[PDB]
Amino acid sequence: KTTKGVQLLRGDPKKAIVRLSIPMMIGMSVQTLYNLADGIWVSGLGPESLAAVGLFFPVFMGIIALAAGLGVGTSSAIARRIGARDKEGADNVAVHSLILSLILGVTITITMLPAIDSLFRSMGAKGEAVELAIEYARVLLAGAFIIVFNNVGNGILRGEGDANRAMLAMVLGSGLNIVLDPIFIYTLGFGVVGAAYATLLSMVVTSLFIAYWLFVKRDTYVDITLRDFSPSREILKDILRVGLPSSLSQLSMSIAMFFLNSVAITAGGENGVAVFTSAWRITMLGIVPILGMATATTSVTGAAYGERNVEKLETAYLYAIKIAFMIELAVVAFIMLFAPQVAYLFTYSESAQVIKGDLISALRTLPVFLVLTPFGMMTSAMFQGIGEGEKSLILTIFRTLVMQVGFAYIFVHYTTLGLRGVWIGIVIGNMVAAIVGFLWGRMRISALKKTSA
């Protein structure tokens, strides 16, 4: 009466990390290929049409930070019960989270829909760029509960080791969205608002398959049934303890990106922001694989934390850092060698402004930080696995807003490095946060050996 995702989740910690990471890397690859190709479609629409997405993109990131945030907290809570062999509790958590996905998604829609016209006019935009963004937001905000349900539902699969179907749910939504984008935007001539319907229909098809697995097939490990009674303020707090900080982590990382561009303004003008933007867009080739192992670390370490197997937890937390470090080592060495080739496809295709000199030198300096992020992300994933999610938020605020932002402000205003000193500061800043992250992790690991012995 045990599923294969669960049996894999409770088994070998080293095997569970590899087996649950590879599906998550593939799913986010399709999500990255969507976001990559979508920009190529929307940019070829016009000037005031490209600004309409720019006004809504922060609103989109905010909703995703809430949906995926609630998804991470749900996945962790279910993973700890399954580790503790508390299926009745893991069932109650799955029902609790699905009820929250309905409450949260409706709250996002009733809140945002009024405060849209006043929000998009705050940046001073007016006319077509505002009216398009208002219509573009009216589409994706009408189906907010689908975005939350798709994230919570995907988290219920990852919580019980079902990373396979949790990957399929991602490739189904993003795959259709890659296909539906040029058809709705160009072939049918819907325009920029067509990209909001391609996303909506894609997430609608995904929601049906998730609901088909959770309520019709019911082949998941958890029993999602409202038949009995168990409203738990304890479970509600346990889900939100990882949920709310994970959302604020995305906000903290976002605010940190806003300051780095303002430092890139002072460092090397306006295209220095474009060189900066084109630089970290390339580093997504390395951030995506880590995000995969981050989702697997949370469910594996949480499964060990629920099983009260601290050695299994530590063996998993260290193995996740070692594997991620070697995958980035290959990614960094690949991007750093063929850097003039990666920039060739990123800046010279548009002969409107050549910025190959600064982007190439940044690709030999910035991707150095990709080998240090596993020390901070696996730590954040391990704090989320054991439930102590506020520690992941503290580690993120220190890494982004303090170390990376601080080292970039100092290496520009108080040195002669200039624009290249921005990438120097982010690497050195992330390097100091790697020490703090990796040490905080192993320090938290030992505290649980004391509590159990």
Residues within the interface to Cs ion (CB under 5 A): 142, 218
Question: Whole-number minimum distance, CB 196 to Cs ion, in Å?
Answer: 9
CB burial readout 79-100, b (16+ within 10 A) else e = bbbbbbeebebbbbbbbbbbeb
Angle value at C-alpha 438, between 435 and 440, nearest 5 degrees:
100
Q: Coil, strand, or helix at residue 338?
A: coil
Question: Whole-number minimum distance, CB 179 to Cs ion, in Å?
Answer: 16
Question: Whole-number minimum distance, CB 292 to Cs ion, in Å?
Answer: 21
Q: Which long-range contacts (CB under 8 A, 24 or more apart) does 415-420 make?
A: 418/267, 418/268, 419/264, 419/267, 419/268, 419/272, 419/275, 419/358, 420/358, 420/361, 420/362, 420/365
Check the CA dihedral 403-405-408-410 and report its sign: negative
CB burial readout 5-40, b (16+ within 10 A) else e = bbebbbeebbebbebbbbbbbbbbbbbbebeeebee
Choice between 5 and 243, CB closer to Cs ion:
5
Q: Decide: 158 and 299 in contact? Cβ < 8 Å.
A: yes
Question: Whole-number minimum distance, CB 38 to Cs ion, in Å?
Answer: 5
Question: Whole-number minimum distance, CB 223 to Cs ion, in Å?
Answer: 5
**Distance (Å, whole) CA 211 – CA 220:** 11
Closest residue by Cα to residue 422 from 263, 223, 285: 263
Question: Whole-number minimum distance, CB 39 to Cs ion, in Å?
Answer: 7
Q: Decide: 198 and 177 in contact? Cβ < 8 Å.
A: yes
Choice between 185 and 434, CB closer to Cs ion:
185
Question: Whole-number minimum distance, CB 100 to Cs ion, in Å?
Answer: 20
Nearest position to Cs ion, beta carbon: 142
Choice between 220 and 295, CB closer to Cs ion:
220
